[PDB]
Antibody
Framework: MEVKLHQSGGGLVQPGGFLKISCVVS????????MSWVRRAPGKGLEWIGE????????NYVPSLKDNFGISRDNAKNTLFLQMTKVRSEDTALYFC?????????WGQGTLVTVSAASTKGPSVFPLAPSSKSTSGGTAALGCLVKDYFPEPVTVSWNSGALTSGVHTFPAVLQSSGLYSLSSVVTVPSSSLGTQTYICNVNHKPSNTKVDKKVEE | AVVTQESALTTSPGETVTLTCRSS?????????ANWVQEKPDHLFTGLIG???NRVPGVPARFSGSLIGDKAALTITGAQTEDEAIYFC?????????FGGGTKLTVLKRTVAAPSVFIFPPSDEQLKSGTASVVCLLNNFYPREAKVQWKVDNALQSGNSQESVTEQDSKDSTYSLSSTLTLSKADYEKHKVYACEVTHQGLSSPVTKSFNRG
């Protein structure tokens, strides 16, 4: 016995497509709570999408989201549904099954919905060359820009795993393209730079693209 | 209707901190049913306050929800480091909820850490593609809240840069951030100076990293 809001049914949809998210509630009287859907995207905060009453006899929406989202529930099965239709590229977010009573007490684990019209593309790797705009004094920053790939999973290593201290691979961001771009950087002493050779190894396995690019000053 | 909160606040363990939440229509009334939700790393959400004053069952007693003047307010009496998170406030406007932008609460786990700023101009290989991306890097800063502004020929830019942050370091509480500004090869070549201005708690004056194309 723990309160479990288990969400499922999120993935890739094209712009103008449809999708239905399930959240099955156990550990609390699902019949007794108002159930809401709320989403979070990287650039935005929390967006309250809508709520449905315990009896399902009233559905409340935010006016700009009324038309494309549809909330339903089944007290017999203890599950809450969200139907997304004609979805926009801006609708990419993590959608959250949340209970409401005194407040937003119980939450779901999160369901990712990616709206993109792209098919599988491999990345392009451009060197982030070090300079004295990229040196501060003693230590120098360099890295790799992994740009316009699809879908998400991409692995970046440095000198085939020899360099792991002080490397930072930032989370990928979804561009207006519908393609992902990401940046990996490392900080090393600037003395090193003349002797050492620096290579970032990027692998995108949905495309089977493996790129070994060096960053030269 | 617009719901507004402080973008970020800093406190230290044991102090008392108060977050505010503002109605664009005027004074927040009980009809607004102010709710307070907390966001922790890996997207973990906790309802703290509902209907202005009510504590959600299970929320610690150090969290209080109130109406102060024209705003709704969340007060943390005896702030803990575990309270370092993002706090969202929702207001009920007759038939729907409207969350605010969020407030980044920092409860000082260590000394303030300034970032080291690095700027990377676009590669010529990318320039052959026909696009140009300027990458700005901030390394090992704490607190998270920092302002990264892109200036193209001293003109503040908007709508053409996207940000990314690393997870908080488990051993020294630092964050790293990436700011990428993407432009046409055409629009890139119609300008001179690309600059990255960085304001932070740890910097007395804003740091600027600049480069000239040409």
């Amino acid at each position: 016995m723990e309160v479990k809001l288990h969400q499922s049914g999120g993935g890739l949809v094209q712009p103008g497509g449809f999708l239905k998210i399930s959240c099955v509630v156990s550990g609390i009287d699902f019949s007794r709570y108002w159930m809401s859907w709320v989403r979070r995207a990287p650039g935005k905060g929390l967006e309250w999408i809508g709520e449905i009453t315990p009896d399902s006899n009233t559905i409340n929406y935010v006016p700009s989201l009324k038309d494309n989202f549809g909330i339903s529930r089944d007290n017999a099965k203890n599950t809450l549904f969200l139907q997304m239709t004609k979805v926009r590229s801006e609708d990419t977010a993590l959608y959250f099954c949340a209970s409401y009573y005194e407040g937003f007490a119980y939450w779901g684990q999160g369901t990712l919905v990616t709206v993109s019209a792209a098919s599988t593309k491999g990345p392009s790797v451009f060197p982030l060359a070090p300079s004295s705009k990229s040196t501060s004094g003693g230590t120098a920053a360099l890295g790799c820009l992994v740009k316009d790939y699809f879908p998400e999973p991409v692995t970046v290593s440095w000198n085939s795993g020899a360099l792991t201290s002080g490397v930072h691979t930032f989370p990928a961001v979804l561009q207006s393209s519908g393609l992902y771009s990401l940046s990996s950087v490392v900080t090393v002493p600037s003395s090193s730079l003349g002797t050492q050779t620096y290579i970032c190894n990027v692998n995108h396995k949905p495309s089977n693209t493996k790129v070994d690019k060096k960053v030269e000053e | 209707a617009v719901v507004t909160q402080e973008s970020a606040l800093t406190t230290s363990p044991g102090e008392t901190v108060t977050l505010t939440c503002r109605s664009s229509t005027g004074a927040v009334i009980t009809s607004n049913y102010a709710n307070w939700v907390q966001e922790k790393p890996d997207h973990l959400f906790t309802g703290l306050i509902g209907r202005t004053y009510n504590r959600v069952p299970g929320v610690p007693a150090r969290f209080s929800g109130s109406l102060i003047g024209d705003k709704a307010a969340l007060t943390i009496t005896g702030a803990q480091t575990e309270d370092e998170a993002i706090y969202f406030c929702a207001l009920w406007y007759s038939n729907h909820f409207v969350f605010g932008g969020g407030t980044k609460l920092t409860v000082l786990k260590r000394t303030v850490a300034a970032p080291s700023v690095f700027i990377f101009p676009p590669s010529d290989e990318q320039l052959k593609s026909g696009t140009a991306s300027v990458v700005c890097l901030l390394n090992n800063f704490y607190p998270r809240e920092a302002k990264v502004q892109w200036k193209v020929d001293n003109a503040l830019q908007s709508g053409n840069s996207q940000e990314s942050v690393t997870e908080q370091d488990s051993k020294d509480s630092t964050y790293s951030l990436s700011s990428t500004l993407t432009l046409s090869k055409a629009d890139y070549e119609k300008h001179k100076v690309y600059a990255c201005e960085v304001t932070h708690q740890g910097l007395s004056s804003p740091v600027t990293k600049s480069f000239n194309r040409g």
